[PDB]
Scaffold this active site. Structure first.
Site, PDB file in Angstrom:
ATOM      1  N   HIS A 101     -10.886  -1.061 -20.094  1.00  0.00           N
ATOM      2  CA  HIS A 101     -11.809  -2.082 -19.536  1.00  0.00           C
ATOM      3  C   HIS A 101     -12.927  -2.337 -20.543  1.00  0.00           C
ATOM      4  CE1 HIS A 101     -10.251  -1.695 -15.300  1.00  0.00           C
ATOM      5  NE2 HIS A 101      -9.833  -0.547 -15.826  1.00  0.00           N
ATOM      6  N   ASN A 174     -10.347  -2.228  -8.704  1.00  0.00           N
ATOM      7  CA  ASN A 174      -9.491  -3.183  -9.438  1.00  0.00           C
ATOM      8  C   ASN A 174      -9.230  -4.387  -8.545  1.00  0.00           C
ATOM      9  OD1 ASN A 174      -9.380  -1.941 -11.855  1.00  0.00           O
ATOM     10  ND2 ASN A 174      -7.393  -0.958 -11.546  1.00  0.00           N
TER      11      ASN A 174
HETATM   12  C1  HEM Z   1      -7.039   3.325  -9.328  1.00  0.00           C
HETATM   13  C2  HEM Z   1      -7.251   3.788 -10.545  1.00  0.00           C
HETATM   14  C3  HEM Z   1      -8.347   3.351 -11.397  1.00  0.00           C
HETATM   15  C4  HEM Z   1      -9.232   2.337 -11.230  1.00  0.00           C
HETATM   16  C5  HEM Z   1      -9.298   1.339 -10.100  1.00  0.00           C
HETATM   17  C6  HEM Z   1     -10.106   2.390 -12.334  1.00  0.00           C
HETATM   18  C7  HEM Z   1     -11.128   1.465 -12.485  1.00  0.00           C
HETATM   19  C8  HEM Z   1     -11.894   1.397 -13.612  1.00  0.00           C
HETATM   20  C9  HEM Z   1     -12.817   0.390 -13.905  1.00  0.00           C
HETATM   21  C10 HEM Z   1     -13.183  -0.780 -13.048  1.00  0.00           C
HETATM   22  C11 HEM Z   1     -13.347   0.669 -15.103  1.00  0.00           C
HETATM   23  C12 HEM Z   1     -14.391  -0.159 -15.812  1.00  0.00           C
HETATM   24  C13 HEM Z   1     -15.841   0.225 -15.440  1.00  0.00           C
HETATM   25  C14 HEM Z   1     -16.771  -0.690 -16.209  1.00  0.00           C
HETATM   26  O1  HEM Z   1     -16.661  -1.936 -16.038  1.00  0.00           O
HETATM   27  O2  HEM Z   1     -17.625  -0.215 -17.009  1.00  0.00           O
HETATM   28  C15 HEM Z   1     -12.742   1.838 -15.570  1.00  0.00           C
HETATM   29  C16 HEM Z   1     -13.050   2.421 -16.758  1.00  0.00           C
HETATM   30  C17 HEM Z   1     -12.537   3.648 -17.112  1.00  0.00           C
HETATM   31  N1  HEM Z   1     -11.630   4.383 -16.471  1.00  0.00           N
HETATM   32 FE1  HEM Z   1     -10.766   3.889 -14.893  1.00  0.00          FE
HETATM   33  N2  HEM Z   1      -9.770   3.383 -13.139  1.00  0.00           N
HETATM   34  C18 HEM Z   1      -8.719   4.018 -12.648  1.00  0.00           C
HETATM   35  C19 HEM Z   1      -8.046   5.130 -13.139  1.00  0.00           C
HETATM   36  C20 HEM Z   1      -8.493   5.864 -14.211  1.00  0.00           C
HETATM   37  C21 HEM Z   1      -8.029   7.120 -14.601  1.00  0.00           C
HETATM   38  C22 HEM Z   1      -6.918   7.889 -13.951  1.00  0.00           C
HETATM   39  C23 HEM Z   1      -8.787   7.494 -15.690  1.00  0.00           C
HETATM   40  C24 HEM Z   1      -8.845   8.737 -16.447  1.00  0.00           C
HETATM   41  C25 HEM Z   1      -8.541   9.860 -15.856  1.00  0.00           C
HETATM   42  C26 HEM Z   1      -9.718   6.496 -15.906  1.00  0.00           C
HETATM   43  C27 HEM Z   1     -10.615   6.559 -16.905  1.00  0.00           C
HETATM   44  C28 HEM Z   1     -11.470   5.513 -17.158  1.00  0.00           C
HETATM   45  C29 HEM Z   1     -12.347   5.518 -18.328  1.00  0.00           C
HETATM   46  C30 HEM Z   1     -12.506   6.571 -19.389  1.00  0.00           C
HETATM   47  C31 HEM Z   1     -12.993   4.354 -18.304  1.00  0.00           C
HETATM   48  C32 HEM Z   1     -14.031   3.960 -19.301  1.00  0.00           C
HETATM   49  C33 HEM Z   1     -15.221   4.804 -18.855  1.00  0.00           C
HETATM   50  C34 HEM Z   1     -16.547   4.329 -19.353  1.00  0.00           C
HETATM   51  O3  HEM Z   1     -16.775   4.253 -20.573  1.00  0.00           O
HETATM   52  O4  HEM Z   1     -17.416   4.034 -18.518  1.00  0.00           O
HETATM   53  N3  HEM Z   1      -9.510   5.516 -15.005  1.00  0.00           N
HETATM   54  N4  HEM Z   1     -11.857   2.272 -14.643  1.00  0.00           N
END
Ligand code: HEM
Ligand code: HEM
Lengths: 725, 726
Positions: A101, A174
């Protein structure tokens, strides 16, 4: 003395429609728009006007055009501290982008609930209808970098930071209600597969390559979120016209300690609208910033994005009532079995001042919950809680990321945490530990309670062995892809077939293509055959005989899963292109605009060149863009008024604009001689979706606005294969 | 096993045409392509086949699909050390992208000089015709992020890392011979101006917004590089088809200590070719990784990028003999006044194994020079020397970036430097300082010498007062932009007028547009008149009376400044789309392909669906991509054979395929009933220059088509595309 004397450099601090003025930072654009988070940020804003230019140390600069040198034509000197600070700061501008993202667009807003929910949750922000909570929202794509395009086929992120009285709550959602994988442990495998391939770093913002479809083919749990992606859900018209979802089951906790299962929903008040793939892929070329731009402009216009927060609610004793596991994040809860009840309204009413300071540095973590909410053992969600705090140590350069202004709570924060890189807070506490007597043990623990209580976990029973093992209850993959598929209109179903077909066509190894097709035979044979035929694959007899998956708790279909089965169109904030000629009929253009203004619809005035044209009656019309400069891709509808049509009739770009709009299923309106254009799009009695009249009658404006309300002209699909656009 | 039995998953380790096989890391794809640097990386290359899946600590993983949890519907446990390691590593994969030239594509290669250059330089790698120097080359845009599109309008970077026996020489160049700005002090101002705007971070990979042109209007030193940018130079067909320049005057130093002034050139063997804008803007949509993909695929095929390194040499006494200053980097040296001596050849012949490991972590600096080269007081270049080392600290996370393998010298490197984040070298020297007696002062200073000497600066006389001041000899801003415009073809000029007009079209404050036009009237009235008209601006009587700037040392023009004025056409490596039908005439195909193979021209076969079709003689033809899937944007030409033309005659995707290529001036060939398509492109029965037609594709038909391709595009066609709605 460099500004123009007419003052045309400065925009107006008034709501103006897209293209009217230069866009400005939100506090300049709209100074009277305020909330507690935005007022709290005043202490860090820097101005510019009537300020001496200085170094970061406050030393005024005499000459910002030159390096200090030993002579005019001399070598540059090490001692030039003004040069080196300037270059040094420039050399260190960039920070790591988000692993996922990375591409996102954001705005300030506020949230208000309709009524106290204190019966089911003790969360302060849902406690009263008059409680108004500031938010900051970032919408994003998933696969691409910060510099990738907006209207790719991908999932969209919908993360919301609620700055509440009892702490920050981050709802990190999402735009589809499920995810591709069951278990957090495989997030890197799945993200590595969709991401650009590690040898040559290709391709950007596209799932249409071999490693993604190889992973999907070998992990059928993916197939339900893939259907959503291959649907028109994968390419929304706007962040304002898509649904948001929490995806996991979470818990609500009330004052008695009673736990209610919840799933979160964002419903767009502007309704659900999507692009079509040819339009979307082309728009990454014509305007890769299309979603980011549209959103800033909707807000500068007053077309405030609005969403309604919705809860799906399930009693604890109801945990096993469905055919699917509530903890399974590849399954949705159909609205037919469990309805969404409206909880509140979120309104995004102000743009940020500095994109890097506020958007790029903003940090959401779904682990940020407040008393009155709690987790479940959803094994995707369990894994996310580790990752969002771990990633910020490198991305935001240390554990003090909460002191970065956008991330700061409005509510008070006090603990024994100390030091770390870029530490801003100067603690006066004699003690950096508890228990302590030297500060009377302040700051102190608070026991849990109905209001302003300390956070305590719900006391969920845990029985079983330490295992790395997938619940057998998760081991069903086809029935939800099928429910989704049967819930779509036939025109949505072709769009899904075409998405699979296009993406698989890009897959170099044919066996990977054949395996994806074999997986589709397991969801529905009609969809499976339509894809195989576009790929020149023939289903075997075994494949033809695959028994369809169960329906979900007896449902044949759910229409809340379709973007369009139940219309919810609102034309406010849409845009029409108006194609001028060198002698426009003033009467037509007068009527056209007053009809659009009345319904909050915007227009851009387009010509074969920039500057001004004069209407038949002498009126000077300024020109917003060229036909090539703002193509049909960027508008909802096209209106051609009457005038000297001969002027544009043989214009290549003017005819193509109509053909591009027509192929993409957009409403088209022709007045007077403008009807002669009916020949380029091979339309004479006329057709549905071409509005035609002697003049822009007002009935004519009513027919056009009604079509815009239905977003696209689906009846038109059989005709567009013929048209070479 | 998950792989297919047939083994279709693995590509052949032998060169293949684009699309034939799946692409592969270069050491799998071409294991016998070697050089001293590719051999030096063998120690860090990691295999995968027949290995246990393990943690970074080498603990074998039993189950890579599941978190450790308490009960199979239970919570995840803190104690799962395997999940946390995998997630952490993933959570920490990105580093900052480069502040500029973030988007880039790179490859390994070698350089050889034509003859010993020891007469003018003691640089070891130019010393001997048998001296083979490995390289790494990165090509790039400037404005866009690492995830932005390849075929934007922008300057391109051409950075070369030479692994010499006497140290690393990085020649860090752009695809035009000047830069936008005179003094390094204003680089941040210019980059802030061209970059997406700070409030809303829009737009990506474009200079077509208010702040870039506000700066251009208020800073006329910019105008010469803007001219190159608004020209077709801004949208090259390939990295293989653009020129390279060092931009700055540098010094060559010979064994005798004589200094000679030099400017660096890269001359492309594949010749100079460019896109048209409509084509390029759309390719950023249809395939944003087009330059990257084409580079990788050319090399996989064996079409190696090749360039000739060329020097412009000025002896020290001629420094003031031009009517522009040699140290001004908004000024160019005309090949008419000073010719490029072709000095050596560089060939790019192997893709990397890992894009992040080798491309993303590669560090270049214009300060990386070797004995036999020296600097000048060019004040843009003087500033660059500080910056390239400074960003490398944040971007590659410390002072040990030279130990990242792709960055490592192949020659010996020993000094007293110690520690720093992620230090790899374990030093055994009892001394970490000199002068020392405890190690007998090793390692030691080397006196300057003709060969293998210590580096010593050229003893240039400095006389001046400490000033922040611009040389008045720098303050002439229009005469080089004029020389450039007069040196272009009429269709090249049209394209410049269109570049300026489209970009100024996207400028929201009209006064900025008026202002840029006022600048163009200082350069040339014809160009200024054509841009004002496209913007609905009327030049004033004053603007009409502006005196043209003077000739550069009395050149009327220089045709080396033009892409097309002199043909340099090479069709080896170009691509043709062949639009199939369900019953293709084998006679037409058999001739089309025989002739392309002979000239090294690639073909992709296209149909309305994937899979295969059968020719009238029973041949099974595999379909490479759909008409939609591989649009005209991605090919040099389109040939349409005979067969059952009715199958695709009413196909909208197929008609539009020909309409796009026509609008983009590409050669089109129609055999037999394929001529029925002439109507969609409004070509008359009589035919027109640039449409190859015959009832069968026999010999003359392909010779006609290949001749059109050598000329790259059909410029004569530009008046006829006004009337095509495409
Ligand atoms: C239903 C599953 C998931 C959803 C809905 C989700 C949703 C999101 C969203 C919306 C963002 C963007 C946040 C922003 O705009 O700054 C994001 C970033 C991220 N997600 Fe997920 N995510 C999911 C699963 C995962 C999983 C399983 C991992 C890791 C274990 C993960 C790791 C991350 C990381 C590392 C970022 C970037 C973090 C940051 O720099 O702030 N996500 N996710
Ligand atoms: C004629 C002028 C210039 C040319 C031809 C030029 C060329 C280049 C090229 C080709 C790159 C990309 C190298 C790569 O692929 O890794 C680059 C990167 C860069 N340039 Fe320039 N540049 C110029 C002027 C400047 C100036 C004046 C500055 C700063 C004062 C500057 C600062 C940088 C920085 C910081 C990078 C990023 C390097 C890195 O992160 O490794 N450049 N330049």
């Amino acid at each position: 003395s460099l500004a123009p004397e007419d003052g045309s450099h400065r925009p107006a601090a008034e709501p103006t429609p897209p293209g009217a003025q230069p866009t400005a930072p939100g506090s300049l654009k709209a100074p009277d728009t305020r909330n507690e988070k935005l007022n709290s940020l005043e202490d860090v804003r820097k101005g510019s006007e009537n300020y001496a230019l200085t170094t970061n140390q406050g030393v005024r600069i005499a000459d910002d055009q030159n390096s200090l040198r030993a002579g005019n034509r001399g070598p540059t000197l090490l001692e030039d501290f003004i040069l080196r600070e300037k270059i040094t700061h420039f050399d260190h501008e960039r920070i790591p982008e988000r692993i996922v993202h990375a591409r996102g667009s954001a705005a300030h807003g506020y949230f208000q609930p309709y009524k106290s929910l204190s019966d089911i949750t003790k969360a302060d922000f849902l406690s009263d209808p008059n409680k108004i909570t500031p938010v900051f929202v970032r919408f994003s794509t998933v696969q691409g970098g910060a510099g990738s395009a907006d209207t790719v086929r991908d999932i969209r992120g919908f993360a919301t930071k609620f700055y509440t009285e009892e702490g920050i709550f981050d709802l990190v959602g999402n735009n589809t209600p499920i995810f591709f994988i069951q278990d957090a442990h495989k997030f890197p495998d799945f993200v590595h597969a969709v991401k650009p391939e590690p040898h040559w770093a290709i391709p950007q913002g596209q799932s249409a390559h071999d490693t993604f479809w190889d992973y999907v083919s070998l992990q059928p749990e993916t197939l339900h979120n893939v259907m959503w992606a291959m649907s028109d859900r994968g390419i929304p018209r706007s962040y304002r016209t898509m649904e948001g979802f929490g995806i996991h089951t979470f818990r609500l906790i009330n004052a008695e300690g009673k736990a209610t299962f919840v799933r979160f929903h964002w419903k767009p008040l502007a309704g659900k609208a999507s692009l079509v793939w040819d339009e979307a892929q082309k728009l990454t070329g014509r305007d890769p910033d299309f979603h980011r731009r549209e959103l800033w402009e909707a807000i500068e216009a007053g077309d405030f994005p609005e969403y309604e927060l919705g809860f799906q609610l399930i009693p604890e004793e109801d945990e096993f009532k469905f055919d699917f596991d509530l903890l399974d994040p590849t399954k949705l809860i159909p609205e037919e079995l469990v309805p969404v009840q409206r909880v509140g309204k979120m309104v995004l009413n102000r743009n940020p001042d500095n994109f890097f300071a506020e958007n790029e540095q903003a940090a959401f973590c779904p682990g940020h919950i407040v008393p009155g909410l709690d987790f479940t053992n959803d094994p995707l969600l369990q894994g996310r809680l580790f990752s969002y705090i771990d990633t910020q140590i490198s991305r935001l350069g240390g554990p003090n990321f909460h002191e970065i202004p956008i991330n700061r709570p409005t509510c008070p924060y006090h603990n024994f945490q100390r030091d770390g890189m870029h530490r801003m807070g100067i603690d006066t506490n004699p003690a950096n530990y508890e228990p302590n007597s030297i500060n009377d043990n302040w700051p102190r623990e608070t026991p849990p309670g109905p209001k302003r209580g300390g956070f305590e976990s719900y006391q969920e029973r845990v029985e079983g062995n330490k295992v790395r093992e997938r619940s057998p209850s998760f081991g069903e993959y086809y029935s939800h892809p099928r429910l989704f598929w049967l819930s779509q209109t036939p025109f949505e179903q072709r769009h899904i077939v075409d998405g699979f077909s296009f993406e698989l066509s890009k897959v170099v190894r044919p066996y990977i293509r054949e395996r994806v097709v074999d997986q589709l035979a397991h969801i529905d044979l009609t969809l499976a055959q339509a894809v195989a035929k576009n790929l020149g694959i023939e289903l075997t007899d075994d494949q033809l005989n695959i028994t369809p998956p169960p329906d979900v708790n007896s449902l044949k279909k759910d229409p809340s899963l379709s973007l369009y089965a139940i219309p919810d169109g609102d034309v406010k904030g849409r845009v029409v292109a108006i194609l001028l000629n060198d002698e426009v009929r003033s009467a037509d253009l007068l009527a056209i605009l007053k009809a659009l203004k009345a319904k909050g619809v915007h227009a851009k005035l387009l010509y074969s060149r920039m500057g001004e044209v004069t209407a038949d009656d002498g009126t000077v019309l300024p020109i917003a863009a060229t036909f090539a400069g703002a193509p049909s891709l960027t508008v909802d509808a096209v209106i051609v008024p009457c005038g000297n049509i001969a002027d544009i009739a043989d214009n290549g770009d003017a005819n193509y604009y109509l053909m591009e709009a027509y192929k993409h299923l957009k409403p088209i309106a022709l007045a007077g001689d403008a009807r002669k254009f009916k020949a380029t799009i091979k339309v004479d009695q006329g057709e549905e979706g071409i509005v035609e009249a002697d003049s822009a009658d007002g009935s004519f404006m009513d027919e056009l606005l009604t079509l815009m309300a239905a977003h696209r002209v689906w009846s038109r699909i059989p005709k567009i294969d013929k048209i070479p656009a």
